[PDB]
Structures are given as C-alpha cells and as structure tokens.
Design a protein around this ligand. Structure first.
Ligand SMILES: C[C@H]1O[C@@H](n2cnc3c(N)ncnc32)[C@H](O)[C@@H]1O
Ligand code: MET
Ligand code: SF4
Ligand SMILES: [Mg+2]
Ligand SMILES: [Mg+2]
Ligand SMILES: [Mg+2]
Length: 360
RNA sequence: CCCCUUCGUCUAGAGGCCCAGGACACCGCCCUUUCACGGCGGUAACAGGGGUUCGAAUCCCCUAGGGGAC
C-alpha cells in the first residue's frame, strides 16, 4: 500500500509532505526529479538528505504503467500499448517539423458508442487513474528522451485524443493535465494542451471551474439528425446546447484565445457534401472557431468510407469562402492503426455490448 | 570545516562584454488559409543585508535556506 506519487498534483503532494513533517518545497524538488528527469528511483535525488530519501522508499513509489508494445509508422508516428491491469490502452507520439505531440488515453475503452470510432467498438471497462494518464506522458518522454533520433523532438504538445471521453473522467483527467502544465511537472502551455470532447455539457461547465486548457469539439455534423446517428450523445445534449456550453468555456479562457477547434470527420456521402458545408457554415456563424476536417480512418467492420480528396477539398473551399480557418488534419500513423479513432487497445467490455448486439 | 542559491522553470556568466543574454512557461495581439491549436510580440531575475573597489551576479563578512566530508 505504498502511495504512488504519479497520482498527485502539486497541491496534493504539498499536503503529502506536510504530513510526515516536511516543508512544501520538497514537493517541488521531487516533481522536478520525476518530470524534468524521468526519475523513478529516490536514490538518485541528490537534492534530498539520505534520511528523507530512505523515508520515501518506506511510504512511497514512482510507478508508471509498463509499455508492453511499440510500433513505428513510416511517417514517424509511434504507438505504445501500456499495461493497465489485465487490459491495455494506447499512447501515440506524433513528430512534426517544429513540434512533437502526444495523444493520451483517458479511459479503458469508451462508453459513448460513436459509430465511426474503433474505440467504441471495444466497449468500456473503467476510467484511468491519474498515474495511468500522466504516466503515458512520463513513459513517452523517457523513451523519446533516451533515443536521440533525428527529427524526434521532446513533447511540446499534448492532446486528449486517445481512447475515451475525457469529460467522463474529470477526477483523474484534470489533475493529470495540471501536472502537464506545472512548471515543476512537464511545463507545457495551456494553448498546446488540447482536450477533445463529444459534448458532455454539464461536465464541460465543471471543467471551466477547474482548469483552463485548449478545447476541441467533436462536432462531425451540420445538424442534429445526422449527428444523432453518428454521435449518439447528441440525443441527450443537442448541437445548440453544446455550442452554448462551448461559448461559456471560451469566455473564461486564455488558453483558447477566443477560438474553439471544430473537429469534423469526413464520412463519404454522409456528412461530406457541398450542401452540408453550407449548412455547417450557417451553424457556426455565432461561434468563433477554427475548423479541423478529419479524413476518416478505417477500422474492421465499419459501415463507412473515407471521403475522397476531391470531395474534402470542395468541402473546405466552401468553408473558406465563408471566412473560416479550415485545416485538413494530416493522417498520421494509419499504417499501425494509430490514426485518430483507430485505437482499439485491449479492453474487457463491462457494458455487455456484444450480448446486446446479438439480441438487436 | 567545505560546496550550493541568477526572471515562473531551466540556464549564459570568471572585476568594465551585463541598468544582466537565451529557451520554454506566463501575459497580450492576430488566426479571412502554417493547426493531432497555428503566427508575432511584450512583462519578468542576480536569496537578503553590509563591506572592499573608480566600478560587484562575480571578491570579502554576516544572516536565511539547501546539500556533502569528520
Ligand atoms: C480525436 C478526434 O478523432 C475523431 N475520430 C473518432 N473516430 C475516428 C475515425 N475512425 N477517423 C477519424 N477520426 C476519428 C473524434 O471523434 C475526435 O474528435
Ligand atoms: C477518439 S475520441 C478522443 C477525444 C474525445 N473522446 C472525442 O470524442 O472528441
Ligand atoms: S469518439 Fe471519442 S467519444 Fe465517441 S467513442 Fe470514440 S472515443 Fe468515445
Ligand atoms: Mg532560480
Ligand atoms: Mg493556439
Ligand atoms: Mg530582462
């Protein structure tokens, strides 16, 4: 029953050190070792006297989840499977010219049932602990830091775009993000830590009272009827209820700089027509934003196709004629099922999704 | 008895190069095309106090807070 320090943000680690009679600055010191240096062994922490180091071994540990698989894409993308009990979730490293980004998982699977997502096909088991979330970053930083490969930069950006809906795990997601932003943690910017959500609107309001981070929304449709089909949570919280919650978040936010990112997956002949772009432009006219079009990444048994490049191009041309910043998300790591939406992991579904499927 | 303390974080520094330079963070402006959040700016430190010197982040003394040898 040793306490894992990877579960604690700054505040909780101060109060940890206040107990057992130590001063607040110890929290600062140990976090620097853990996060600036990827240190999991108290012996190596020269900042601290040998008495307090031997004392920490008694009551504490630094335990990130194990990497059990690595795959490398031809485009530079790396996917790691991390062991989480008997199950697994994925972490994805994305090197770009001027930056490097890590996509992190928030849940063991997902319970939201989006029809175009491989993670949904796996079902849902549970939420990840803080240590299991920030541990992905820790473990990726250590692996990337060791092998000094050409064009393989340290992590500058983090996206909550792995397995699971982050807003359904605020207890653990928020503290993990706090450690990403903390100067004594990873020291990342507000503006380059982006949480993506499908729209759990009461939770988005809660998020606003807890932490300010960059925000992307999984819109994927120009109207409620199409969205009800592909992103079922739109039935409980429709587009306007969601867009309103977004505008509330933006009002308090330095991280978003006045703009939400609109995520929009391009499904062939479903939501991808010129007609739909016009309707989407109208829909977003009162929501300051940037549009990120995502070519659909396939998975086994999916009833969709990827929008052709010409259909995507015409869709974006339309949007640009309405004055919207419009970017096609380059597909990264699809040769190793690491592209957005292809993260299957290894999940034990607790929602009886399989036995429900056969009973129609 | 010996070493350590420079912007929020990590650092450049060796008596005039420094009213202290950089990276990232933070803040601000812009995003009507750099986006798996993009572009450009701006604020910001010599642990504290007192000596030495024409001149101190730098040399000396004390104090506060960390290590380390007997
Ligand atoms: C991280 C973003 O990826 C989207 N997403 C989910 N599944 C897929 C898929 N098969 N292809 C492309 N994008 C997908 C999201 O729903 C979210 O907005
Ligand atoms: C694979 S989706 C990851 C982010 C979030 N669950 C969303 O739908 O936007
Ligand atoms: S898309 Fe994001 S939310 Fe919808 S299912 Fe896949 S993961 Fe859960
Ligand atoms: Mg300092
Ligand atoms: Mg940005
Ligand atoms: Mg200055």
């Amino acid at each position: 029953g040793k306490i894992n320090l990877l579960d604690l943000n700054r505040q909780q680690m101060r109060e940890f050190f206040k107990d057992l009679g130590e001063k607040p600055f110890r929290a600062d010191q140990v976090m620097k070792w853990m996060y600036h240096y990827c240190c999991d062994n108290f012996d190596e922490m020269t900042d601290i006297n040998k008495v307090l180091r031997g004392k920490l071994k008694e009551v504490a540990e630094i335990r990130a989840p194990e990497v059990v698989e690595e795959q490398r894409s031809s485009d530079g993308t790396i996917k790691w499977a991390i062991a989480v009990g008997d199950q697994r979730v994925e972490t994805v490293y994305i090197p770009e010219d001027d930056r490097a980004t890590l996509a992190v998982s928030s849940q063991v699977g997902c319970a939201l049932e989006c029809k175009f997502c491989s993670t949904a096909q796996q079902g849902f088991n549970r939420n990840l602990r803080v240590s299991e979330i920030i541990g992905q970053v820790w473990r990726a930083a250590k692996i990337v830091g060791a092998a000094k490969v050409t064009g393989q930069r340290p992590i500058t950006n983090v996206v909550m775009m792995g397995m699971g809906e982050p807003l359904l795990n605020l207890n653990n997601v928020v503290p993990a993000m706090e450690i990403m932003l903390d100067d004594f943690g990873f020291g990342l910017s507000k503006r380059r830590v982006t949480l993506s959500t499908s729209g759990v609107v009461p939770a988005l309001d809660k998020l606003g009272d807890m932490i300010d981070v960059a925000l992307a929304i999984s819109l994927h449709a120009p109207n409620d009827e199409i969205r009800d089909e592909i992103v079922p949570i739109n039935k409980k919280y429709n587009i306007e209820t969601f867009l309103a919650a977004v505008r509330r978040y933006l009002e308090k936010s330095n991280a978003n700089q006045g703009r939400v990112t609109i995520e929009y997956v391009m499904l062939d002949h479903v939501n991808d027509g010129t007609e739909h772009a016009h309707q989407l432009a109208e829909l977003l006219k009162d929501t300051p934003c940037k549009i990120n079009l995502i070519p659909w990444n396939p998975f086994p048994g999916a009833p969709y196709g990827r929008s052709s490049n010409s259909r995507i191009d015409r869709f974006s041309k339309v949007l640009m004629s309405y004055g919207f910043t419009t970017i096609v998300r380059k597909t990264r790591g699809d040769d190793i099922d690491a592209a957005c939406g292809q993260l299957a992991g290894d999940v034990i579904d607790r929602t009886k999704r399989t036995l429900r499927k056969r009973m129609q």
